[PDB]
Amino acid sequence: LPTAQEVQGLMARYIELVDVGDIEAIVQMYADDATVEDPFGQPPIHGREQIAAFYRQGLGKVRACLTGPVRASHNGCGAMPFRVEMVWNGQPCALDVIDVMRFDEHGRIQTMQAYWSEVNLSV
Amino acid sequence: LPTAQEVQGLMARYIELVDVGDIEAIVQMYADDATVEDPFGQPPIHGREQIAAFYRQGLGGGKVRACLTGPVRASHNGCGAMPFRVEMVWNGQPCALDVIDVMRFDEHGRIQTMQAYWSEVNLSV
């Protein structure tokens, strides 16, 4: 189970991979039985093909960067604030998000929860 | 059940109450049978009696400040998450801690669960 320092590293790596847009490398970070709730409040996505499809839809000119430190626990979990910059039909947008993640004993993402709503979106 | 906007206001209010150190007002924001996990990974404390004891031990010695360090992220199912920093004293030393709280509210606008993400990696003296 990743240590607190290791959680900080894995969560920051996740943001770096979103920022470059490497869907394959993102999906590799997930465990077989992982779930993604994004935005939190929506039904969970599960299944490796389904998680890949989610990232392909979302990322298929998106940029993302941490906007504060990763907060990590001693039980393989963490939470991080970040901002996503995207273009909607040629229009620059930004979205503030916090992801909460639980990692398994192999260092793979078991659960991803992305908190945000329209109150967090600007143009 | 608070809307997204209402979650933003409640969670911001919470930080205001921590910042001023109003233990009773904090405890009244929680559901009577709420759970707190702080830091997340430690066993849950249950109920306003235990939660009050927790906030009294954390705040009742004064000198705590707390402020949001980014916007509250809110959902449409009465939940939210926020980044903040707490400034504290350790026997005369200034301390600071970066935290993210996640909260779920009940159908009465009270905090049903709170999870506070941080560890010593987030602590600076």
Side-chain angles (χ1 to χ4, degrees):
Chain A
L1 210 70
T3 64
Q5 290 181 10
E6 285 172 339
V7 170
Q8 294 190 295
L10 286 158
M11 291 182 70
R13 169 177 171 68
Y14 171 86
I15 297 295
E16 296 285 45
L17 295 175
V18 171
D19 183 60
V20 80
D22 194 329
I23 298 157
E24 284 75 20
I26 295 161
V27 171
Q28 274 178 30
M29 290 188 80
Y30 280 91
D32 290 351
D33 55 348
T35 61
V36 165
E37 289 163 273
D38 186 340
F40 186 78
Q42 287 302 309
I45 293 171
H46 64 275
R48 199 171 289 276
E49 176 182 12
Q50 285 70 34
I51 289 167
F54 168 84
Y55 283 100
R56 203 164 308 280
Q57 278 152 26
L59 306 175
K61 302 296 181 77
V62 176
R63 299 291 299 274
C65 192
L66 287 169
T67 50
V70 176
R71 281 69 159 180
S73 80
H74 294 296
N75 72 338
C77 298
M80 63 185 159
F82 59 107
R83 176 164 234 119
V84 180
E85 289 171 345
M86 55 289 200
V87 186
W88 192 358
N89 303 143
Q91 180 50 63
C93 300
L95 175 71
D96 295 311
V97 182
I98 280 170
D99 281 355
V100 174
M101 292 175 150
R102 171 182 294 272
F103 289 85
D104 69 16
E105 57 184 349
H106 306 282
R108 306 185 96 185
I109 302 165
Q110 196 65 74
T111 59
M112 155 75 84
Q113 295 167 317
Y115 289 81
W116 62 268
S117 68
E118 296 85 356
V119 305
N120 299 123
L121 192 53
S122 50
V123 54
Chain B
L1 191 70
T3 62
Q5 290 185 175
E6 286 171 337
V7 167
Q8 295 192 300
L10 290 160
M11 288 188 73
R13 169 171 175 69
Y14 171 88
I15 294 295
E16 291 310 296
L17 296 179
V18 174
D19 184 59
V20 78
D22 191 336
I23 296 159
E24 293 174 339
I26 293 166
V27 173
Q28 186 65 11
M29 291 198 72
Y30 279 95
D32 59 90
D33 62 343
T35 63
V36 169
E37 289 162 93
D38 186 337
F40 187 71
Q42 291 291 297
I45 61 163
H46 285 261
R48 283 178 175 166
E49 180 185 34
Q50 290 177 23
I51 288 168
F54 170 78
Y55 283 95
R56 181 161 300 292
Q57 295 299 284
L59 300 170
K63 300 122 167 270
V64 178
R65 297 321 301 265
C67 188
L68 285 167
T69 48
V72 175
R73 280 69 157 188
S75 77
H76 295 297
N77 70 335
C79 301
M82 66 187 156
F84 61 108
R85 188 181 179 69
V86 185
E87 296 181 0
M88 4 169 191
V89 291
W90 209 169
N91 278 11
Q93 275 201 126
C95 312
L97 179 69
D98 296 310
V99 184
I100 283 171
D101 283 0
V102 179
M103 287 181 176
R104 168 161 76 82
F105 289 81
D106 70 14
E107 292 185 338
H108 311 275
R110 302 201 184 82
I111 305 159
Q112 190 65 65
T113 70
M114 187 270 268
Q115 297 90 49
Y117 292 82
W118 62 271
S119 58
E120 299 76 4
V121 305
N122 298 119
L123 190 49
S124 48
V125 175

